Structures are given as C-alpha cells and as structure tokens.
Ligand binder design. Sequence first.
Ligand SMILES: Nc1ncnc2c1ncn2[C@@H]1O[C@H](COP(=O)(O)O)[C@@H](O)[C@H]1O
Ligand SMILES: [Cl-]
Length: 227
Amino acid sequence: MLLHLIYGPTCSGKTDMAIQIAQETGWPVVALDRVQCCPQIATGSGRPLESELQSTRRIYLDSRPLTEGILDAESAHRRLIFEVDWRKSEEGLILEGGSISLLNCMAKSPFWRSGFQWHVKRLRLGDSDAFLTRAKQRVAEMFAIREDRPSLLEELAELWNYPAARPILEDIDGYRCAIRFARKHDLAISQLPNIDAGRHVELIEAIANEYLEHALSQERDFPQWPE
Ligand SMILES: Nc1ncnc2c1ncn2[C@@H]1O[C@H](COP(=O)(O)O)[C@@H](O)[C@H]1O
Ligand SMILES: [Cl-]
C-alpha cells in the first residue's frame, strides 16, 4: 500500500490538494485532525463542505460529542492505525491534516516505519501577510450564511447553550477568538451573528491572527517527516 501524507499548517490548501488526488485515484482521505472528529463544529474545525468533496470519501478518526472532550492524540493514533490497517488490500490512501499532537504520535510510532511505500508532502508557512490573506478568506467562507450547513457563529451559539461545552470551545481556534471578541464588546454569544459589517471585519481579522498564531506553533512543534 502507498500512503500519501500531506501535512502542514492551517490554511495551506492541504485539504483541496487531498481532494484532488482523491478524485483522480478513487482513494479515501483520512483526516489527521482530532478537532474535526466533533461534527457539532464541522464548519469552524475545517471540515470540507459536502459540495466541495466532489464525491470523494473523507474519513474521520471518531465521531463524537464536543462535551466528551476533543479526542486525545494517543486514541486518535490508535484509531488511525486501524483505518489504515483494515484497508491494507487497497492500492493507496491519502493521510491529510495538521494535528501537531497526532503527527508527533505518528513520528514516534513503529507502525509507519515499515510495510508502506510513501509520498510525503509538507506545506510550509510562507510569508505572514500571504498567510493572513488566505486566513481571512477562509474565515469569511466559514462565516457565510448557507442553507446547507451552519456557520461557525451558528455552531458556536448552539453549543453555548450547554455549559460544559463552554470550557472546551475556549480551547479551540476560531471559537476562542470569537468568544473573546464577544466579551470584549459586551455582546452575548447568541448575538455574534447579528453584528454590523464594521464589527464583522474586525472579527474576521482577529480570527485570522489567531490562525497565524496557530500556524506558527505548527511550524515549531511539527515533526520533520523523512522524505
Ligand atoms: N481543526 C482545528 N480547528 C481549530 N483548532 C484546532 C484544530 N486542530 C487543532 N486545533 C487547536 O490546536 C490545539 C492542539 O491540537 P493538535 O494540533 O491536534 O495537537 C487544539 O487544542 C486546538 O485549540
Ligand atoms: Cl488546509
């Protein structure tokens, strides 16, 4: 089996690039992401739209309530070995994402050391202002009102109803920013979808900055995968 590993920081187009290989090959893409295993935050965690998937399969390591906590790395790693191992007949698989903790587990693990052919791609953080431009665009996409999927702000207001979800959303990118933006201006979280467009731009900007901060960590704590 051939494993096509695509990894790198947030907003580096890794997802689209995975999808493209998946349409050409017919191979599933397995998301190397813990946060995306909570579908109640599908949009804000970076899950592609069903329309964007272009009929390819994208596999998550678990499907879980946000209030059960984000899947831990060692559990997600064990889950990942499983999704690969039972598909071992298949010609290939695409592993794509940016979970720092799960990539590091992959790098300590004997499983990946033998038994596979490999195509490895690391996307790198480029210049910051190019990064920010792409970050903002992405945030605006997640913010867009659609009749087929909740916005990030909608996902956030829905959960904010459940007190146990509150501590957990405050440790997640986009959400932490959005929560802090609301307190900063004395708005209720429920009220975040209804802000004037002037306040909307301020928030796109702040979330982008929180993405840059995260992409910078990804660059430090990412394992250097051998090519
Ligand atoms: N898809 C994602 N969306 C938002 N935040 C994320 C995502 N993946 C990781 N994070 C953040 O990065 C921190 C470390 O997770 P990880 O990169 O999976 O080890 C998490 O606690 C989240 O705050
Ligand atoms: Cl990406």
